């Protein structure tokens, strides 16, 4: 029944009171989050898909159909470091108490955690894959467009996904590529396509990716599912840092390099439908 | 004995069900709607 | 009798409190509802159609208005196979209770109903006919045009149906067939006909059923009868399904594949007007 | 005094309690009512005009005013099937009661009533003329302009009616013409004149006329008097109608076929201030 | 008998009144009115 | 119809 009191507890399974502020900052900053819808299910899941068609007590000809079974698993894990190096000793944070310590971390672990999920969410670059990404699904079912940038892009982008009875909804394009869309104005009619004041491309919601991976890419998605469950769950010690390198050469001798370093791991998982459009440059 | 077991499990079940309202609050902050 | 309380019951015939939430959500997805009117009946009524025109106090009527006798009845049944299999056991949803059971089903069982209803209603492709569909009425009174998309052809289409009785109300064309609407720019009168922001072909508002059947379709009705009456009427089962197909080859062995199934028999009825327009490709 | 209780009154002269409900919501359907204005009267009226002004006793004026009378009258009677068609379950409509009887007519006889009225007021096609207003004003005072779509033509339409002190109030253009309002853009001051979301042509409200006559109509007035006096009234009968057609080449045998007709005796009013403009087309 | 019959008139009428509002809801939802 | 007078002017767009 802790709330304020003290803080020398190295272990720290977060309470649902302190979980709701830290999660909303992780969510609202992310790009894949603002696209996808949600539903609550456990670490292992059984969800089922597809439509049905049936008459009211009658039979003539045939009526084909199918149902598919699906599941979700695995979690994302990353340490703070940026927090731990700028936090000397636990007796300081004992005086600050349990309440403040997680609100001081709210803009510390959050910004780093969501950033990794985007890199292995849309793209398939970072080493944390599970259900294959939006990028990998495009390679299976080819919705590829040749390297051009005019009004013909938006006609092609929609038309590929349009053939599968799917409506265009989102727009995922990076901030470097965003600058190129500003100059594009309609030829016959006198009106601009993309705008900052009115945040929309084709009168649709737009989102900016900051991942150092893409070059001149475009992406539109509608149907998507994402899952968060369990608790963040904290544990904190001074023993060894293998994944983190200390600038020059050596990794970290934690008794020598005296730093209070914590651990974080949320149960986050995706689910993807395999019909999404894409555009990219060619040149030669 | 019997009342204690039922009432404790009912309080825990509702608190886990209020976790889904947090998910619905995040749906409000989503751009697409 | 059935308030919040609980739910371990196999049968679950709905109350009007829970019914009209679900029947309302059918209409947003459905497009045939927008094309027609609702005027209800229990099992079958012998009501009448066609508008009334005023004779006036001063001079006689002279021009005729005419009436028409109709009477129709049929039901549309849909087993929620994906939804029933979503449920692992009925005792799990006893915790959700009778009220929240249908709120989870609200945006799912309705998805199944409108997909069947619109498919067989407008086209004669889905095998559950009754009163002859819009596709059949086109073959009676030939308003068919050769596959062309030009500013002259769209006005000519409305001119054909105008000759008999009433002016056009609204278009019904595919989502897939949206690239032809974009490319139409006439040389003499430099403009685009179809709006990009709003949805309208030549002023008349367009919508789509999203049935995997049409190619280059352009259907217009205006005068049409839709019916929704009675209760969906829920029954839960676990025995055998002939009109479903599981996985790949097998039909459904419910004792072996231990899953539930929700049989729901809604009652919907239709009627079609005589004069309807249509366009389609051919080439060779 | 009449109560809710029951229903077995053939002469259904509506009381002021139920006269207002049906007359309130018919106005939203009507186009001419929104353009004009409502007032009360005795039954048949006479209106006066002109501006008799003079000072105290400085000097007697050279010019002198004229004082003139202008009358308005005439009614419009209809026989709708609507609820007489539901004679097979009038005993069920008795269970709904005298109050709910007219509530089911509220979007039925009103929908038939307004469509006739707009054809008489704006157009002069239908056979119920009395206040020959908009169609006749164009014939007397020639305010016709050649068919083009520029901002100069919009100012030209206003300038002709502004010559005799009348301010431009509101436009009347049908939904088919709405497509042609997209292309209007000025060379110097590049901006949209007709906004897509905000239904306004040049910052003035637009009203879509559904009667298929005017192809590219652009009418401006904003000065009328429409008025519904007294009681709509009801009469039921089972007689052989002269002005009626049954199926193809027959007459409505009401004694044999168990039908019924609802007579409705409504009142109409129109006034003409003859300064109205119009535009259509160049050649075709 | 006589009092109970009048109660049944009010119950069945109010039940079917919600059916007519559904159709009035349909008119508000659709594109042309 | 005194209530009709006020509501009629409220319904219409021109004012």
Numbering used by the authors:
A (entry chain D), C (entry chain C), D (entry chain B): 26 to 309
B (entry chain d), E (entry chain c): 40 to 72
F (entry chain b): 58 to 72
The paper states:
The CP models show the expected HK97-like fold common to the Caudovirales, divided into A- and P-domains, with an extended E-loop and an N-arm that folds along the inside of the P-domain. Many SaPIs also cause the redirection of the helper phage assembly pathway to form capsids that are smaller than those normally formed by the phage and are therefore unable to package complete phage genomes. For SaPI1, we previously demonstrated that this size redirection depended on the SaPI1-encoded proteins CpmA and CpmB, leading to the formation of a 45 nm diameter capsid with T = 4 icosahedral symmetry.
These hexamers sit on the icosahedral twofold axes and thus have strict twofold symmetry. The SaPI1 procapsid map had the internal protrusions previously attributed to dimers of CpmB. Closer to the capsid shell, the density became interpretable, and was modeled de novo as residues 41–72 of CpmB. The C-terminal part of CpmB that includes the RIIK motif forms a helix-and-hook structure that is almost identical to that formed by SP in the 80α procapsid, and makes similar interactions with CP. Contacts between CpmB and adjacent CP subunits are more extensive than in the 80α procapsid, involving several additional Gln residues in the α-helix (Q48, Q51, Q56). Each CpmB dimer straddles two capsomers with legs that connect with the capsid shell. There are two types of protrusions: one that ties together C and D subunits around the threefold axis, and another, weaker density, that interacts with A and B subunits, connecting hexamers and pentamers around quasi-threefold symmetry axes.
